Amino acid sequence: HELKEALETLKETGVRITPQRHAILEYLVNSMAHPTADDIYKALEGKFPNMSVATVYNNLRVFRESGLVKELTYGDASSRFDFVTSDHYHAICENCGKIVDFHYPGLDEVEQLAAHVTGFKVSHHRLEIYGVCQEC
Amino acid sequence: HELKEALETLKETGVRITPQRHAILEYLVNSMAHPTADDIYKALEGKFPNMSVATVYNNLRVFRESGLVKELTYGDASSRFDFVTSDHYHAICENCGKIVDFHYPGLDEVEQLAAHVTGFKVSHHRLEIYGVCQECS
Ligand SMILES: [Mn+2]
Ligand SMILES: [Mn+2]
Ligand SMILES: [Zn+2]
Ligand SMILES: [Zn+2]
């Protein structure tokens, strides 16, 4: 399980798992959205009455640092979060902004090709597909 | 041809070409960098003593709107600009931010595949490749 593994990964970097830090994870696993802190907040305010939104935004910043989630920094504005379940391409709606998952290998090529044509130690690549829902 | 065609396209949407508006283009064609307003500014302050940075930032915003240049919005603070041609790929330096340009036909595949697996009216795609120089340079 993705819970099981992730929970051990926290232990590994030190991070102790309080009941709320757990609740945030279980949510990130189950919710096949790409939620923002506030969606996590209002979903979990439960239940966790004394937890602030910044605190969500902090736990997430912990999880990010220990490679248990990616921060979709784009853009503006508020930030979205995936879960490094891996991996993974993003198709976004130009209108509502929803984020269907989808996979496509491969893929390299560049890495490999550009590495050739530019003389660059290629770290990784980012690929986004844009369109519309579903309408929306 | 580069200039010739572009100059005609301004004429097309109406936009009149003053000496400075011209100087900006010739620069954008010649400089196979992906300059920012300020690189264009300090390069052309010349020569064009009375033209402000915002003015550059405006003519470029004109050129953008009439599809003669793309604005590399990413990111944070300053914006980069690339004189549109065809059609087109970017590999970025994680250290100094240099932008080479490569080409990988193609393409698509998805676009097409995703369109199938998600039920989307796929407009376009964006692809960057990240690495390091060259060391840098
Ligand atoms: Mn995703
Ligand atoms: Mn380019
Ligand atoms: Zn939509
Ligand atoms: Zn570099």
Side-chain angles (χ1 to χ4, degrees), chain A residues 1-7 9-99 101-127 129-136, chain B residues 1-10 12-136:
Chain A
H1 217 141
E2 291 146 334
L3 260 306
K4 201 172 162 186
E5 271 207 21
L7 280 161
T9 316
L10 268 346
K11 281 144 51 199
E12 279 204 359
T13 20
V15 194
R16 189 240 121 25
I17 310 87
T18 44
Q20 44 189 62
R21 281 180 154 169
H22 193 270
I24 291 154
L25 265 174
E26 209 174 330
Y27 184 79
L28 276 152
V29 186
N30 316 160
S31 261
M32 32 229 169
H34 290 52
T36 62
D38 334 80
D39 326 337
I40 301 174
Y41 168 84
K42 46 207 181 89
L44 285 176
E45 69 187 307
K47 217 155 182 167
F48 295 94
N50 282 288
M51 208 214 337
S52 80
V53 73
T55 280
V56 187
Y57 235 108
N58 297 318
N59 297 337
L60 284 165
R61 196 136 188 151
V62 168
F63 301 163
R64 215 230 306 109
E65 285 190 297
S66 84
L68 269 191
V69 75
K70 305 296 176 180
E71 174 169 41
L72 288 157
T73 176
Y74 227 75
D76 283 289
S78 87
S79 166
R80 281 170 158 266
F81 300 86
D82 210 316
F83 185 58
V84 303
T85 181
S86 161
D87 65 332
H88 211 69
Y89 284 114
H90 280 171
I92 334 167
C93 169
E94 274 154 326
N95 195 65
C96 76
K98 77 193 289 190
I99 313 188
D101 255 10
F102 107 95
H103 305 284
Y104 191 92
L107 200 257
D108 19 88
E109 62 98 16
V110 210
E111 344 282 14
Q112 292 158 28
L113 171 68
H116 180 270
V117 307
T118 64
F120 269 28
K121 302 93 93 181
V122 175
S123 148
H124 73 295
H125 68 262
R126 220 277 274 189
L127 167 74
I129 279 83
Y130 306 91
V132 191
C133 312
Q134 286 163 70
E135 183 241 30
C136 286
Chain B
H1 168 270
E2 296 309 341
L3 284 301
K4 177 173 180 180
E5 278 180 68
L7 286 156
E8 211 55 79
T9 337
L10 273 334
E12 177 143 56
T13 43
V15 178
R16 312 204 84 259
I17 306 82
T18 57
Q20 64 200 42
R21 267 171 172 178
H22 187 262
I24 293 158
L25 262 171
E26 176 170 335
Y27 191 65
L28 262 62
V29 181
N30 303 0
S31 191
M32 62 274 104
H34 292 47
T36 60
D38 306 62
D39 325 329
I40 305 159
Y41 177 127
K42 69 200 181 193
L44 297 183
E45 60 205 357
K47 184 155 214 174
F48 296 92
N50 279 251
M51 210 211 326
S52 90
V53 74
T55 304
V56 189
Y57 240 115
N58 292 332
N59 297 295
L60 288 163
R61 230 134 165 181
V62 164
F63 298 165
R64 196 252 268 93
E65 279 172 291
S66 60
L68 263 208
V69 80
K70 294 263 239 173
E71 180 175 357
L72 304 179
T73 178
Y74 209 76
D76 176 41
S78 137
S79 333
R80 282 172 163 284
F81 300 93
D82 186 25
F83 170 71
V84 301
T85 156
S86 254
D87 179 48
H88 187 53
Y89 280 128
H90 282 131
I92 332 176
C93 194
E94 231 163 48
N95 194 59
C96 63
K98 185 179 179 180
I99 330 84
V100 191
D101 274 324
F102 65 101
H103 291 291
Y104 186 80
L107 228 167
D108 17 308
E109 197 71 13
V110 85
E111 303 156 21
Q112 280 148 220
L113 163 64
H116 173 268
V117 291
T118 74
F120 264 44
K121 181 180 60 180
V122 173
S123 164
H124 72 300
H125 73 270
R126 193 253 304 262
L127 174 134
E128 274 117 7
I129 271 123
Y130 311 93
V132 183
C133 301
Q134 292 285 125
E135 207 224 2
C136 294

